[PDB]
Design a protein around this ligand. Structure first.
Ligand SMILES: [Ca+2]
Length: 615
DNA sequence: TAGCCACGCCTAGACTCCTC
DNA sequence: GCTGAGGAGTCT
DNA sequence: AGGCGTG
């Protein structure tokens, strides 16, 4: 009796956004009418819409449309949708390119034939270039070809870009708390539902929390429109970079750079600057900064470094947008000056200024530090004394390295085919530890999540919960998450540091039994084979260790979430555990990884780097 | 397989778009 | 260079 | 596109 998965999920999106009064302010009357028109359709008509909303947006032959779970004949349904003005028909098919596109290459031959001026053979593309030229000079004749092609192509439909645009913008908002926002969704096909979401949104159950918002992200329907535009730009840039179309990317960026400079002074930006960090990331300003970042990324690739340094300096001079990224920026500026512009004076100024900055953390901070000690203790440099300058000697403690071997066939080994990580697990089984988990960061994350679930989804912090389908409070990756909860956390961290290893085992089974299945961003329910396995692990890890890890994950999830060892292995009976970063022959330790390793040792834990050698 | 040409048929592999 | 696996239909 | 037979 239920709806198909795709419709359910689509409906969940609309519901969610529709019930925000703050968000409904950003749609005009005409627009809201289109939503209502949708709900006014038959289950069948809704089913067909979502189907094609998901598809790539373009003309579709009627003979290539077939969904039997919808209707054995689709003409009634199609009409309904055209009447509603959601779809359109060959009647409205006007553009020549569009018609030639819609044709099969065989049919494009027939048409190249019965039109004499055309040379019958070549590629679909070649023929389309032929036709599209011909018509641009002798347009009257173009009309005749258009006429005939349409006939030859037959009956056809296409989703209406007017109504569609509204559903995009709704989806965009749903995504500011979700599926573009749990890290950038490259929503191609013009703006759609991500696959994971399209499949499970309808069935997903979410944590219990209390929505309390007391600020507007957007000024008005124009602001949002300006934003959504920045978003589509940023995407296309990334998209370009991703397809190695670096030349096109440069344009798009420089183009967008102007756009951002034109906007300076607009009233809307004053309220933006004043927004707290965890919300400020949802503004044009932020996205344009994010764009500028990729821009230096692009410049660097085209080996245009003086330029790249300029931009880096811009970014670093303001403190309004993306402060988390300053670590990265400094580091990158440092490198570029030193390495590619070979310019030592500023490099030293750069390093010192960066290290001064409270915004730089973990990995990048260390990477800076090292460049300094490399620099101070270099001959062709020693003509100074300015990096002796009371550099608080941030040493990192060294850790037990180890080496094993496996015959190599991402690298794939044999023992049965396997990965580097599975190969190492084998070693540690025969080394006495009958248990092990390849979870990297997730393992530690889902413990921290089972151990602080209620403090996470705790009430009393303004603005972090905003609507129906969240999986985390919005402040989770900000300095403010800990600060906005210092009392309750300082408490719980203490209480874990002291707990007996039964308190732990119990604590876990509460959360597990209460929440098992609820979507939360830190917790992965199938990460552990059972609740039982989850309990063993915390027993071996124990209080002081767990508590210590949790402190960093609460204090700075932004800069800590990454760099945990690939493995946790433990022996069932001895209760001794081991934390293992598995390194192939062809990679090393990253700064983020070593900071962690030192840190886990100070907490007193069996930490080990395990290299693999191939044959 | 003598060596070269002329012509057209068939299909493997790449690619796009779609599905859950 | 990867962050999904797989199928079907089409082009050359 | 490009391998293959056949004329
Ligand atoms: Ca590894």
């Amino acid at each position: 009796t239920g709806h198909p998965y795709y419709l359910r999920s689509f409906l969940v999106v609309l519901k969610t956004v529709l019930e925000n009064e703050d968000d409904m302010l950003l749609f005009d009357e005409q627009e809201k009418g289109i939503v209502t028109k949708f709900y006014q359709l038959s289950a069948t008509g809704q089913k067909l819409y979502v189907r094609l909303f998901q598809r790539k947006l373009s003309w579709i032959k009627m003979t290539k449309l077939e969904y039997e779970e919808i209707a054995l004949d689709l003409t009634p349904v199609i009409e309904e949708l055209t009447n509603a003005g959601f779809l359109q028909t060959e009647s409205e098919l006007q553009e020549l390119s569009e018609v030639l596109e819609l044709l099969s290459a065989p049919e494009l031959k027939s048409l190249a034939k019965t039109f004499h001026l055309a040379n019958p053979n070549g590629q679909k593309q070649q023929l389309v270039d032929a036709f599209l030229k011909l018509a641009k000079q002798r347009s009257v004749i173009g009309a005749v070809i258009l006429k005939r092609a349409k006939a030859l192509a037959g009956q056809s439909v296409r989703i209406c870009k007017g109504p569609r645009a509204v559903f995009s913008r709704i989806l965009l908002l749903f995504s500011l708390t979700d599926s573009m926002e749990d890290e950038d969704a490259a929503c191609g096909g013009q703006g759609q539902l991500s696959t994971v979401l399209l499949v499970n949104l309808g069935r997903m159950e979410f944590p219990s929390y209390t929505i309390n918002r007391k600020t507007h992200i957007f000024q008005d329907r124009d602001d949002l429109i300006r934003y959504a535009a920045a978003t589509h730009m940023l995407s296309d840039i990334s998209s370009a970079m991703a397809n190695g179309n670096w030349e096109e990317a440069k344009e798009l960026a420089q183009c967008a750079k102007r756009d951002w400079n034109r906007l300076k002074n607009h009233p809307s930006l004053r309220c933006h600057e004043d927004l707290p960090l965890f919300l400020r990331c949802f503004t044009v300003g932020w996205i344009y900064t994010r764009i500028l970042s990729r821009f230096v990324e692009i410049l660097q690739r085209l080996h245009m470094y003086e330029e790249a340094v300029r931009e880096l300096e811009s970014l670093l001079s303001q403190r309004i947008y993306c402060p988390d990224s300053r670590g990265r920026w400094w580091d990158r500026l440092a490198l570029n000056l030193h390495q590619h512009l070979k310019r030592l004076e500023p490099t030293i100024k750069c390093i010192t200024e960066g290290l001064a900055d409270p915004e730089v953390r973990t990995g990048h901070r260390l990477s800076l530090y090292q460049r300094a000690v490399r620099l101070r203790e270099s001959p062709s440099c020693k003509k100074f004394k300015h990096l002796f300058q009371q550099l608080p000697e941030m040493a990192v403690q060294d850790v037990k390295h180890v080496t094993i071997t496996g015959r190599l066939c991402k690298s794939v080994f044999v023992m049965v085919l396997c990965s580097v990580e599975e190969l190492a697990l084998a070693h540690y089984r025969r080394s006495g530890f009958d248990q092990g988990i390849h979870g990297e960061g997730s393992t530690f994350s889902t413990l921290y999540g089972l151990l602080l679930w209620d403090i996470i989804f705790m009430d009393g912090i303004p603005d972090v919960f905003r609507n129906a389908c969240q999986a985390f409070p919005l402040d989770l990756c900000t300095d403010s998450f800990f600060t906005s909860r210092r009392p309750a956390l300082e408490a719980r961290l203490q209480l874990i540091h002291d707990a007996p290893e039964e308190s732990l085992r119990a604590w876990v089974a509460a959360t597990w039994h209460e929440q098992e299945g609820r979507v939360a961003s830190l917790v992965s329910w199938d990460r552990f084979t059972s609740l039982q396995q989850a309990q063993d692990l915390v027993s071996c890890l124990g209080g002081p260790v767990l508590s210590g890890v949790c402190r960093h994950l609460a204090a700075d999830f932004r800069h800590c979430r990454g760099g945990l060892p690939d493995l946790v292995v433990w022996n069932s009976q001895s209760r001794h555990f081991k934390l293992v970063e598995v390194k192939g022959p062809n990679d090393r330790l990253s700064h983020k990884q070593m900071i962690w390793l030192a840190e886990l040792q100070k907490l007193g834990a069996e930490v080990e780097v395990c290299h693999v050698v191939a044959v």
